[PDB]
Each structure stands twice: as C-alpha cells, then as structure tokens.
Symmetry: C3
Subunit: 115 residues, 3 copies
C-alpha cells in the first residue's frame, strides 16, 4: 500500500503510507553558501510536501544535518526560523555529518502528515 | 491534525499525530560527564513522553548520537540498559555526531506510541 | 500495543506498531570490505523485515550511515541499487558517521510498512 513519488533506482523522493509522508533527505541546488543552501533545501522540501499531499504546517519531524555544526548552526537557524509557518515548528534534531558531496553544507530529512 | 507540545520558533519538543509521538532530540541539563548527561537526557525524554501521552514502555525507535562513540558508548549503554523498562527495549541506532553545543556528549531522538 | 522482535536489554531488533515496523540499525556480519558489508547489512534487513511482517518492497525510509562517505558511497550505491526491488526504492538519506565498532563501514536504519 505505499505510494511513491519521483522514483529512480536509488531512491524515491517521497514514500506515502497511511497518512504519513517520508521524504528523502533534501540537498541544496547550486547555492554555495550556508544561507542560500538552507533556503534551497527548504524550497525543495516545500515542493515535495506538495507533491506528496502534505504542506509545511504538517511537518512532524526533521533531522537537520550540517557539515560543520559549529560554523553554520546560527545561519541554519536564521533561515529555518523565518521559513517555518508561524507557531507550527515541527520536532527537530540538528547534528553534524558529512554529506555525500563535499560542497553540501546542509541536508534535511522530513516526515510529515498527509493533509 | 498534528498536536504540538512546547513550541517555540525553532522546534516543538514533541509533535503528536495519529497515535504516534515524535520527540525533538533531547540534550542533557548541566551534567558535564557522559554518565550524568545520559541520565539527564533520559529524564527529559521521560518527562516529554508524559506530556505527549506516551511512556517509556511505548518507545518505538531511538537514534542515539554520541559526540565520541568510541570513548562513551560503554557508559551510554550502562545508563541506557538500567533505565529501560524491563524486557521492553525499543529499536535503536547509535552513531557518532557532533551536537550543536560542544559540551554535549549525547543526544537522543525518540519516536513513541501514544498510550 | 507495540510488539517486539528479538529483544535484549539494549534493543529490540524490530518494534511493530499500527502497521509500521521500526528496525534497529543493522550492521554487517564478518565481511571486512564495503561491498561485502553492505551486502550483509541488506541481508540482515531482509531477514528482519520477514520476521516483523514486512518485505523489501514495503520499505518506507532508510538512513544509511557510512563511516567514510567520500570513500565508500559509490560501492554502497552499487550494492544498494542492485538489491532494491525493481522500481520500488524507498525514501533514503545517506550521511557520514562513525559506528559503534571501528570495523563497521556501513549501518542502515529502516522503517517499513507491515504487509
């Protein structure tokens, strides 16, 4: 009964099952700086929630991976707090981890509620 | 239909949806050592499960982040195994990651079942 | 209402709740190389999905932890893409993290749908 969105032989961008939406970790576009990269990740999450039948106000959890948490946490929080729908922040966890490409400073993995 | 617990402009400590509870990653209080910090994280999880309508016996998954997994895994396991309700350990994953503040040695992210 | 599979005082290999299956992070057997270790992790996930009432075609999410993401991502992807049931890739996130034992190059944490 799972439904899949934008599937290739490595991943589906989203998997939907019983009112839950599981998004693949989202990475930036071509932005090179932490502020722009966080903005681009959040834009991609915005678009995928739409395709998977959810929306920003229905995020349940987000794991935020930063390549350098000491250097970039403050910038991440600036963009994140401005993006979230007012009064509707999800649960979150922010940790340091290198991502699959060295240029990536931030990656975010979301679970959300359909609706 | 999500419900939120202890929300600010960065995160909600918990988000509840369809009998699931999603907790933000929990960090220690003022303890400075791994044993005490793990005890404090688990105390905070205990209290949040209560507010979100769950309990320790209903944990589904826990990601345990250690700043130094080689150094501190044994201590983490001592405190963890003593804290868990008998015979009711959840699924878990323990990995190394630097946390948002350098003093933090351990952070734990829980999903639990309402009830 | 959770059900547990293969429980000890540290973890349950799986916890089942309301049509969801939460697997503990799975680690390799005795393989020493990234290709073999990834194969062994995926074999273990295969077996646990079976015991927990799911199957590979019903994976919802996978966090893939690599000890060295720059060195080993390509090998991970070779084994992963060949293992997945055709056209049915789950959501995934791949990040770098040291695992609990230094010989472990890869660990994978799965959530799946019962059925």
């Amino acid at each position: 009964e799972p439904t899949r969105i934008a599937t290739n032989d490595r991943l589906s961008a989203a998997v939907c099952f019983d009112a839950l939406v599981f998004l693949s970790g989202q990475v930036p576009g071509q932005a090179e700086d932490i502020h722009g990269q966080t903005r681009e990740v959040l834009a991609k999450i915005d678009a995928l929630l739409a395709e998977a039948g959810s929306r920003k106000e229905r995020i349940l959890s987000a794991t935020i991976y930063l390549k350098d948490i000491a250097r970039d946490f403050a910038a991440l929080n600036e963009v994140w707090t401005q993006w979230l729908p007012t009064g509707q922040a999800p649960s979150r966890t922010t940790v340091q981890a290198e991502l699959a490409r060295p240029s990536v400073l931030v990656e975010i993995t979301v679970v959300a509620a359909r609706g």
